[PDB]
From a paper:
Here, we report the first crystal structure of an ecdysteroidogenic regulator encoded by the Halloween gene, noppera-bo (nobo). nobo encodes a member of the epsilon class of cytosolic GSH S-transferases (GST, EC 2.5.1.18; hereafter GSTEs). DmNobo forms a polypeptide homodimer with a canonical GST fold, which has a well-conserved GSH-binding site (G-site) and a hydrophobic substrate-binding pocket (H-site) adjacent to the G-site. Consistent with the requirement of GSH for GST function, a defect in GSH biosynthesis in D. melanogaster also leads to larval lethality, which is partly rescued by the administration of 20E or cholesterol. These data indicate that the nobo family of GSTs is essential for ecdysteroid biosynthesis by regulating cholesterol trafficking and/or metabolism. In general, GSTs catalyze various reactions with an activated glutathione (GSH) molecule in the following three ways: GSH conjugation to a substrate, reduction of a substrate using GSH, and isomerization.
GSH and EST binding did not affect the overall structure of DmNobo; the root mean square deviation (RMSD) values for each pair among the four crystal structures were comparable with respect to the estimated coordinate errors.
Residue numbers in the entry:
A (entry chain AA): 3 to 228
B (entry chain BA): 4 to 223
The structure:
Amino acid sequence: QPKPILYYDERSPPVRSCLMLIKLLDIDVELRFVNLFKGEQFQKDFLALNPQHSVPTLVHGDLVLTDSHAILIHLAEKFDEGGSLWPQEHAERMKVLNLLLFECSFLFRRDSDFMSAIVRQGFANVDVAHHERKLTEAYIIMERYLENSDFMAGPQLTLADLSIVTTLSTVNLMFPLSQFPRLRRWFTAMQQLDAYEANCSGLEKLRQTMESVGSFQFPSSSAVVT
Amino acid sequence: PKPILYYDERSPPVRSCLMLIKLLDIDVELRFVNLFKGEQFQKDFLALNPQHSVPTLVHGDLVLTDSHAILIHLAEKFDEGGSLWPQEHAERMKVLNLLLFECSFLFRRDSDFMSAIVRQGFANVDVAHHERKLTEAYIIMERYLENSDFMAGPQLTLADLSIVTTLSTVNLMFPLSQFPRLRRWFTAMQQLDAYEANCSGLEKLRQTMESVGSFQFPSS
């Protein structure tokens, strides 16, 4: 019943997906900033709330959620009851769930491995070709999904698109989409949604933070901008 | 049409699905895909699942490529109204939150360790690094068990089935002796009839890892 509280750092793509859903559904939510690059997620009180030391973390009454994909489903079920973002029909809902788990286990995992290598080693010491292969593989899979539909999980916008677009925009700071016409079309369409504005500041903050910590510049030509 | 499960029982996410199939008496058709021979890269399997992973379930026209989606789908279709995937929203969110901890944290870190063994050889893995990453997962689970007998509340749910198989896999290398709640919970899980579905693939994974990584686990 009390309004949700979101612990967040907008540089995180999963955080941005929750910010996008909050904007799309017009949800009133208290924001509490946790600076991941300063290690504020290791403060004792935050660790007591979420021992995984991660954002987004949502506190909604007694419920404490520590994964973006649970937060997206929870907020859709509470603030979009009966809607199409988290579909009513079982098969369509399982397709969206399957895509959310692809984002967690495959796209995000590989982008996190790459970006954490940059922070830990410096960009000049990362095997960028290795990560390019891993992440281009994810682009190929997404292009294949979109060869069948204009959205990731079917013919309409779902939570899968909100979860995937933020991490895709993050991978695309580095790796261009010139060779992926369906992924370009979809990303352009997602950027026309008013809710996409919630992605913009955090993407830019992540770009700047990574350039500083990793001592490099992303190639400006890569990012798709409309 | 009955569900088809593409599987290699060495995979802990596969074992979680085998455990649920045994608990719910689901009639499935099993099709083996050998992960250590690279059969997940065969062209027909890749056409089905471009993430080249098991478990993969084909149920009618529905193709699921992640164990946590498979667990939820099978519970919804074959255990409607049961307690493994709770009806009440807050309880269900708690289960979902733990399934995603398993995917994003426990499994990710065990995968990173076990992959390192296969790629580099055990003698060349930074075991102390992986011990810190995996012990941190043990610490988190010990905290999750502070208030309840099971991972997501007072009774067995899908979260326990997902977590127990990967935990048993981490436990090939790293003992539970420092984590009393977690050790008690693991012993209780081993007493379930359905836990028998974990045993064969866990031992096969032990043997395959010891051969490929040229070592013996401490627990061996």
